[PDB]
Amino acid sequence: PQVEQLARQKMWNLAERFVAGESIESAIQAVQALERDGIAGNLDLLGEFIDSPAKCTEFADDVIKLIEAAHAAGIKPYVSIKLSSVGQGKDENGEDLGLTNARRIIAKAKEYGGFICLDMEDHTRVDVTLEQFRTLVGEFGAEHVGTVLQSYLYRSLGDRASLDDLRPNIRMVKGAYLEPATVAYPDKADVDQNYRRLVFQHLKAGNYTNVATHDERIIDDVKRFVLAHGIGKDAFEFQMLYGIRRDLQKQLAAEGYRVRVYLPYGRDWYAYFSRRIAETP
Ligand SMILES: Cc1cc2nc3c(=O)[nH]c(=O)nc-3n(C[C@H](O)[C@H](O)[C@H](O)COP(=O)(O)OP(=O)(O)OC[C@H]3O[C@@H](n4cnc5c(N)ncnc54)[C@H](O)[C@@H]3O)c2cc1C
Ligand SMILES: O=C(O)[C@@H]1CCCO1
Secondary structure, three states, rough: HHHHHHHHHHHHHHOOOOOOOOOOHHHHHHHHHHHHHHEEEEEEOOOOOOOOHHHHHHHHHHHHHHHHHHHHHHOOOOOOOOHHOOOOEEOOOOHHHHHHHHHHHHHHHOOOEEEEEOOOHHHHHHHHHHHHHHHHHHHHHHOOOOEEOOOOOHHHHHHHHHHHHOOEEEEEEEOOOOOOOEEEOOHHHHHHHHHHHHHHHHHEEEEEEEEEEHHHHHHHHHHHHHOOOOOOOEEEEEEOOOOOOHHHHHHHHHOOOEEEEEEEEOOHHHHHHHHHOOOOO
16 A cells, blocks of 8 residues: 555665665675675575475576676675575475475586575474485585584584584574474573584584674684684684674674675565564664
């Protein structure tokens, strides 16, 4: 309705803190702005839990269009995908559709020297995502595909250790989803301690670690750990969501740490944006 135009625009203005815009062009412009401030980008097309196999494959094709556009602009493709957006769990001609679309995405990013992260979704998808991650590392190399472990899950430390033979690039996060006490630590102090164990164990193992958090107490303790263990500032990076603690993003880059910002865009922004709102301090 014409009467609702102002409210629709106001909601989008709220979301624009967290979402670059709705187009590939808006996302590329936002990454160029980050790079001018010494910060790297990690592109994501928004959307998840896509029901139709056709739409899952269209979504993968749109991620490929993004990778082509980034490359043509002189940006090394670094893209995060949710496998539920590209068909994970659905069979097409005897193979998992998420796996076959992820192969196409990673092959394209790798042609251009790029990288794909498999985001971690809710706990029901962890086993299949870790199985598919191991398969994809075998096909494309640990330099070209990474994944995520969530510190709120009891299983995560064991999962991290199980992956060490792959020398994998892993992003450590607290965890974005609603999870019961049989699956996830209810006490935030345990989530935060387990976060440190994941980062510290990954660094000691010599694997590339993405320290994805806006929690300054944790960030300061990671700086301390890296100093005490003689770890180079080329061996890991901090990561933050677009729009959150921009001051820290800039400060860390000025101190010579690597910083890479998760940079989402697209028309289907409601789910991601709703999680940002629910997280408000
Ligand atoms: C780059 C990146 C990628 C991620 N990828 C995944 C993934 O694939 N799967 C997954 O389950 N989780 C993922 N996460 C984690 C999930 O998004 C977090 O649980 C959430 O970001 C919690 O924020 P936090 O670690 O800053 O800490 P918190 O303890 O939640 O917050 C720490 C402080 O950060 C600031 N802050 C954090 N969030 C907000 C906000 N929404 N609004 C305003 N201030 C805020 C506040 O100052 C807050 O007190 C990712 C997080 C990051 C940073
Ligand atoms: O989708 C989300 O809310 C989180 C943050 C980025 C990747 O997974």
